Write a protein that binds this ligand. Structure first.
Ligand SMILES: Cc1cc2nc3c(=O)[nH]c(=O)nc-3n(C[C@H](O)[C@H](O)[C@H](O)COP(=O)(O)O)c2cc1C
Ligand SMILES: Cc1cc2nc3c(=O)[nH]c(=O)nc-3n(C[C@H](O)[C@H](O)[C@H](O)COP(=O)(O)O)c2cc1C
Ligand SMILES: COc1cccc2cc(CCc3c(C(=O)O)[nH]c(=O)[nH]c3=O)ccc12
Ligand SMILES: COc1cccc2cc(CCc3c(C(=O)O)[nH]c(=O)[nH]c3=O)ccc12
Lengths: 313, 313
């Protein structure tokens, strides 16, 4: 019985990894994720220049999940590129590097640089489409023309297999349109479903106050709040993109949650809120919990059940 | 005591009512909601003809909320009109009637007929903008030109103050666009935020199966999953629509949750999943809990704190 996977020409001890932005910003963070029992790690979404991000408090967590408006704080692309080219030990596990340029041109500039490193070391690119474009327009993946533009330009500039990080959708017509856009791009080999459920608002009843400072307390939601939304999006893309992998992200706190993701179609399973709260020991727990479920059901490998969610009649 | 308020030229004993679709479909249901301690009731969204709705099971609930793909089962507009015109006891509490035609024409035909009953009896219209719009197109509220068409035609045909039931949005540019549309229509006097969070997917780990039959298990989410989303939409529209009321809906299980909706800007608070699960006794508990929080804080009126959520710095 085992949790091993072989995809994208890499080998993974298990399907678990951090969600971009959690425990991935500094060399310290990335060494910690490497030392953990996760099957892979992804670096913090980066921009060409270093960013401080939004004013604090900008992340808060509660029994049912988290809210954040971090504002893309990061050490800048050159730092993440150097970690991939010079510091990461690929004998431990594979590395994804997430990029999140604030314009299509910024993304093209980073991927042009990353390509030779991707080619020579095998670092894998996750392009974040659940990011701001022009203020007053919707985020890139909610503007299908912008999304197409970004994928066209990054595909041409990078020239190698990559994947994308998608926001959640809530309408079947949007699943159909979004998947059709992605299916135009053969280099998009994995789709990560999902980024945080956008612009929620947490209010503390005792203080009568929002809990994060930026954007009048509005921010993205993660954790237990978003699991059914995550599963839907994983399965919607798994069904619509049969030539791509789907990575699941959202609401994983247990091996049972990971099992549901995998039944929905997930190949890797990312852990954000629960990792931020529990720390990297979570990975051993999740491995143990998932293996226990597999033993009860007689499943020896992930492929035996991946995507095999049953529907009714 | 007491929680009495005046809105839209009607007196309400308290701000609580059912959410449309819950405990409102049959004359029995409506009689039961009338007998309750709620301050108002709203009928099941209706169509011109009666509908059986989707195959069962079509609703399921869990500790964190519910998922549903009911498919608009209802007794038909003629029945809800007759209830409004002949059967409802207006001396008990106000009545809202929810309309959810499948095209703009169908809405216009129902509202033309509802208008004289509204003038005569004071029944209030809630137009459901989650009404599905041409298939392969996004629900109407997610199609801003269709939404504007709907409201233009309903406003002309109905000619009296009404409100609208809105799906959640997740992007600030969409809040700006949607609120601008609504502000084009002076007869739209209340906005109810939110309908169910669309197309989530609940999977049962033991059976490896989705839990509702329609649409391969995909359905709208309600309950604890959606409270921060509901609060965000309530506050976003409250800020953007200063000449309208905002009704809150989503995740209310307690007087504390109602308190947060009200702080966000809610005038009435609707109760869906928790009412489905607890029954109409919930209204006395909510009342008691909300009065207990007001007492502890020194608030004597709802007006003292409605919309007064604090931001940081
Ligand atoms: C503090 C924080 C920072 C994050 N930063 C990023 C980011 O830099 N890039 C990105 O793609 N997603 C980012 N996310 C989103 C997560 O990767 C993930 O998609 C989301 O939190 C949902 O998963 P969860 O329910 O496990 O938290 C961030 C989330 C949190 C809580
Ligand atoms: C079984 C069921 C039926 C519903 N039918 C309707 C409807 O007919 N019209 C409507 O506007 N919303 C309908 N809704 C949505 C609810 O009114 C409410 O917007 C949603 O459940 C979120 O509130 P909650 O978290 O209190 O459940 C329905 C919800 C459920 C669970
Ligand atoms: C107000 O929100 C933002 C301001 C500036 C830059 C932003 C960049 C992002 C993308 C990074 C990101 C973040 C983030 O760094 O805030 N948080 C997430 O939950 N998911 C993400 O993908 C999101 C929000 C931003
Ligand atoms: C697959 O879902 C549908 C098929 C046909 C008509 C539908 C009509 C609606 C609107 C009624 C409604 C329903 C419902 O009746 O399914 N559920 C909600 O959570 N909110 C609503 O506003 C929703 C879903 C429908």
């Amino acid at each position: 019985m085992c949790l091993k996977l072989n995809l994208l020409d890499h080998v993974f001890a298990n399907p678990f990894m951090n969600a971009a932005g959690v425990l991935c910003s500094t060399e310290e963070d990335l060494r910690c994720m490497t030392a953990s029992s996760s099957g892979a790690l992804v670096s913090k979404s980066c921009t060409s220049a270093p960013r401080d991000g939004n004013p604090e408090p900008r992340y808060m967590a509660f029994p049912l999940g988290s809210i954040n408006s971090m504002g893309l704080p990061n050490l800048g692309f050159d730092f993440y590129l150097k970690y991939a080219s010079d510091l990461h030990d690929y004998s431990k596990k594979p590395l994804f590097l997430s990029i999140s340029g604030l314009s299509v041109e910024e993304n093209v500039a980073m991927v042009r640089r990353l390509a030779p490193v991707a080619q020579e070391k095998g670092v894998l690119l996750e392009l974040n489409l659940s990011c701001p474009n022009v203020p007053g327009k919707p985020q890139v993946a909610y503007d299908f023309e912008a999304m197409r533009t970004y994928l066209q330009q990054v595909s041409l500039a990078y020239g190698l297999p990559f994947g994308v990080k998608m926001p959640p959708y809530f309408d079947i017509a949007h699943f159909d349109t979004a998947a059709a856009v992605l299916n135009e791009f053969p280099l998009v080999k994995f789709v990560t479903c999902v980024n945080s459920v956008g612009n929620g608002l947490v209010i503390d009843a005792e203080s009568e106050s929002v809990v994060i400072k930026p954007k009048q307390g509005f921010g993205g939601l993660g954790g237990k709040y978003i699991l059914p939304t995550a599963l839907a999006n994983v399965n919607a893309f798994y069904r619509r993109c049969p030539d791509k992998l789907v990575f699941g992200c959202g609401g994983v706190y247990s091996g049972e949650d990971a099992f549901l993701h995998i039944l929905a179609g997930a190949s890797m399973v990312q852990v954000g809120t629960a990792l931020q709260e529990e720390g990297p020991g979570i990975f051993t727990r999740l491995e143990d919990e998932l293996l226990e479920i597999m033993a009860r059901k007689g499943y020896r490998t992930l492929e035996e059940f991946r995507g095999r969610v049953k529907t009714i009649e």
